[PDB]
Amino acid sequence: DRPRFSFSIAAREGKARTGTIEMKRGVIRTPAFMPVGTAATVKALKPETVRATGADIILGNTYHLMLRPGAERIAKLGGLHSFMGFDRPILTDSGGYQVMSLSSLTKQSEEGVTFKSHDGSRHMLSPERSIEIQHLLGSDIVMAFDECTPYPATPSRAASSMERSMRWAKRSRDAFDSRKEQAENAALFGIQQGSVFENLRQQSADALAEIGFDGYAVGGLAVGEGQDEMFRVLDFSVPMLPDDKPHYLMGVGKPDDIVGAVERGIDMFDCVLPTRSGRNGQAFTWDGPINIRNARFSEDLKPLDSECHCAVCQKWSRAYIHHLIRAGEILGAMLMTEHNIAFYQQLMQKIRDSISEGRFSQFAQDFRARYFA
Amino acid sequence: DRPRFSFSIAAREGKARTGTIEMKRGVIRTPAFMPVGTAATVKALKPETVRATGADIILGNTYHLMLRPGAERIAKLGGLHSFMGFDRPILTDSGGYQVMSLSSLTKQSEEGVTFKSHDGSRHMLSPERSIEIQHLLGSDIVMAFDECTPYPATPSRAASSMERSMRWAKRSRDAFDSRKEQAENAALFGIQQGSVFENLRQQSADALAEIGFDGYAVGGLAVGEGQDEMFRVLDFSVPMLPDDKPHYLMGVGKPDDIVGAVERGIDMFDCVLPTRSGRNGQAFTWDGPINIRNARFSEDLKPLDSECHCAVCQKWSRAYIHHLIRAGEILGAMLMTEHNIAFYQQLMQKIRDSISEGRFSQFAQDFRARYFA
Ligand SMILES: [Zn+2]
Ligand SMILES: [Zn+2]
């Protein structure tokens, strides 16, 4: 039977790594892409379809679920896995980021954040309550509760925010450890902050390693800084994290961002881009993204992508999906989403295979040359 | 290899019949329920899911398709079956009814109807053009072009409308027969009109039988007259149609309407009720319909229906689907629609089996006693 948590690195090329995370509910192949389930559903897909695309794990957003249907209610009903019918690992975010972006009348303090539901109902969120909600949902990978520092940030503000987040990381660790069922069956990840400043990124990494976590996220990136700056920060930030644990880049991203982040030592990713932009007509292909609503696709009998192995590309044309999206049909969202998530999983598979074979550098070059042709 | 069209009655009980229609693209078990595909999709379902529920045939709405993506375009792309990925029989309506209900600035004449797209683009629709559009789509069962007489109608207006529709039925027959590929591979149904008036229903049946069709629809019902009146008209109208051909009640209906119509000799049905009302939260059960959005379902772990064999009822709870529909999630529409269409197909299967076993009267009584408890 599988352990609570074991990360094993099978092959390396430069800073890139490929391997597996074993957990009670399944094995996660890394580098991994996690489709996002916003309110207990990966939008427009049955869980069996999510699995069929190759996903090993999904991300569940806590903020939405704590408001609707409610964490206690989900626990009463048997937990998130049973509720939504997805039996493999689920990583839950802490809820803190969406509180700031989506809710109103927020009040921050050292204790946590109070906020009004985007309902007007009132609520608190502290490290302790976030860890508890993630427990009630039955999360397999629990994220420590922290603050995503705005970009740009002054050094003083980035430091203050990072320091509070490290105090909150210790509180998150202690809350998780004080719940026996959670500590024995789930994993806890800590989040590095520090904005774009190397000294703050180092202090944050040191604090997180002293507390000790099962994995380490690079937080606070993909917040408007652009790819060059994101990569510059990853260049010095990822080596600060423990080498023997997974490295998770939150909220990234576009295919080229993923490739470059893997080149810099990242093992895990999530983003709404394939699902959200799929519903809005953007399809990913090896030759770059296309907008299926464009009139040039109205009589195009080719599949979305000429090499993609997904069920959508085996069965339906660009012309049909163009019609569906233009007509506002639900099946359009279903088909675009399945294809995009399958594309992302095929990208991750090519990344894993190329690292395993010692030809990832060449893959990255070939991928870019074609994707940006 | 199957014939163009063969209807065979295997068993009878009173006026009810069960049997099969053989066509080139498949066998249709009767009495049959046809899910509605409005714009080349049964809303929120892949074609494989439509088939998995038990459907043998779907209805395609012509009016929407002739506007978007266009009949000529669909023909260029290989026809409706290839376009949408559904390889079994498709019955197409004539387009006339939605022209009147949905379009603007309509002008009627003996030639046909001119109308403005609900776009503002202009278009004509005559018997000849309707049959041509249905050919371009690649329809297996083509409906003659007629007028659905408003309810209530005076005897004079009902007669004038019926008489024009019979002239249009002959034009539809001749247009269909003058296209060799269509005449050899598809079937043509004529539509009885006459409002609620027995003498006009008889004149209409006589005219249609003299022209000769592969099947006969009862048109002009389910237009606001109520079930008692609908059944009263069916009582005298269905026996006027040729016994040895299928009888199609257009735009019906609720489960009890279907049962009573089968008791009166109807073999085929279509309606948007299971799909449309599913997206709006109404689920059909053997104990009557429920509205899944009701708060009483928020913690109900039972499936939508306790006996239903569909995949939704095997995997997900009322509580989860309640959450999805309240949240506006696409998966809610998908699951409600799959269940409702599966329920309708299970109803049709129980009807067919009970007629085949000579216990349909008892089934109808048992069905009503429980559905309306
Ligand atoms: Zn594909
Ligand atoms: Zn069901």
Curated annotation (Swiss-Prot), chains A, B:
Organism domain of life: Bacteria
Molecular function GO labels: metal ion binding; tRNA-guanosine(34) queuine transglycosylase activity
Alphabetical keyword list: Glycosyltransferase, Metal-binding, Queuosine biosynthesis, Transferase, tRNA processing, Zinc
GO cellular component terms, semicolon-separated: cytosol
Pfam families for the chain: TGT
Positions contributing to substrate binding: 93-97, 146, 193, 220
Active site: 93, 270
Function: Catalyzes the base-exchange of a guanine (G) residue with the queuine precursor 7-aminomethyl-7-deazaguanine (PreQ1) at position 34 (anticodon wobble position) in tRNAs with GU(N) anticodons (tRNA-Asp, -Asn, -His and -Tyr). Catalysis occurs through a double-displacement mechanism. The nucleophile active site attacks the C1' of nucleotide 34 to detach the guanine base from the RNA, forming a covalent enzyme-RNA intermediate. The proton acceptor active site deprotonates the incoming PreQ1, allowing a nucleophilic attack on the C1' of the ribose to form the product.
Family: Belongs to the queuine tRNA-ribosyltransferase family.
Name assigned to this protein: Queuine tRNA-ribosyltransferase
Name of the gene this protein is made from: tgt
